Amino acid sequence: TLLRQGIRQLKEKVSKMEPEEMTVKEKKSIIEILKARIALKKAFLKMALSESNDTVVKKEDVRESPVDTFMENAT
Amino acid sequence: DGLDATLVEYQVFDSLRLSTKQFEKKYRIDLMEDRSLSLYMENSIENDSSVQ
């Protein structure tokens, strides 16, 4: 989530090969602590896994089939 | 003491026979025209972040 924008944003935060780097990059390491605990935000699994969750989807794609059929029996 | 005599080594307190004047020049630190440590904080300074 925050990590997703955080990749593209930590991207060009780097400033040349000069010691201009670490003067900001130590605080960036603090940001790395912060994101290290952002990993804790995603510490547990919800629905199983792709594609096993996708298998659940296709399972619904079979489960949708009766739904499109029994109405034909309305009369 | 609470300790076994047999496992002990006479030691020395650097922080004792020192002049207050040099005491400060060993432990005390400030932002007053100092900030010399930042030369060592490497790698990563902050810098100074926020209070704390």
From Swiss-Prot, chain A:
Disulfide bonds: none annotated. Signal peptide: none annotated. It comes from the Eukaryota. GO terms for molecular function: transcription coactivator activity. GO terms for cellular component: mediator complex; nucleus. Residues 55-75 are annotated as: Disordered. Residues 56-66 have a biased composition (Basic and acidic residues). GO terms for biological process: positive regulation of transcription initiation by RNA polymerase II. This is Uncharacterized protein C24C9.04. It comes from Schizosaccharomyces pombe (strain 972 / ATCC 24843) (Fission yeast).
From Swiss-Prot, chain B:
It is found in: Nucleus. It comes from the Eukaryota. The tandem 7 residues repeats in the C-terminal domain (CTD) can be highly phosphorylated. The phosphorylation activates Pol II. Phosphorylation occurs mainly at residues 'Ser-2' and 'Ser-5' of the heptapeptide repeat. The phosphorylation state is believed to result from the balanced action of site-specific CTD kinases and phosphatase, and a 'CTD code' that specifies the position of Pol II within the transcription cycle has been proposed. The binding of ribonucleoside triphosphate to the RNA polymerase II transcribing complex probably involves a two-step mechanism. The initial binding seems to occur at the entry (E) site and involves a magnesium ion temporarily coordinated by three conserved aspartate residues of the two largest RNA Pol II subunits. The ribonucleoside triphosphate is transferred by a rotation to the nucleotide addition (A) site for pairing with the template DNA. The catalytic A site involves three conserved aspartate residues of the RNA Pol II largest subunit which permanently coordinate a second magnesium ion. The C-terminal domain (CTD) serves as a platform for assembly of factors that regulate transcription initiation, elongation, termination and mRNA processing. Belongs to the RNA polymerase beta' chain family. DNA-dependent RNA polymerase catalyzes the transcription of DNA into RNA using the four ribonucleoside triphosphates as substrates. Largest and catalytic component of RNA polymerase II which synthesizes mRNA precursors and many functional non-coding RNAs. Forms the polymerase active center together with the second largest subunit. Pol II is the central component of the basal RNA polymerase II transcription machinery. It is composed of mobile elements that move relative to each other. Component of the RNA polymerase II (Pol II) complex consisting of 12 subunits. This is DNA-directed RNA polymerase II subunit rpb1. It comes from Schizosaccharomyces pombe (strain 972 / ATCC 24843) (Fission yeast). The gene is rpb1. The chain holds residues 877 to 928 of 1752 of the full protein.
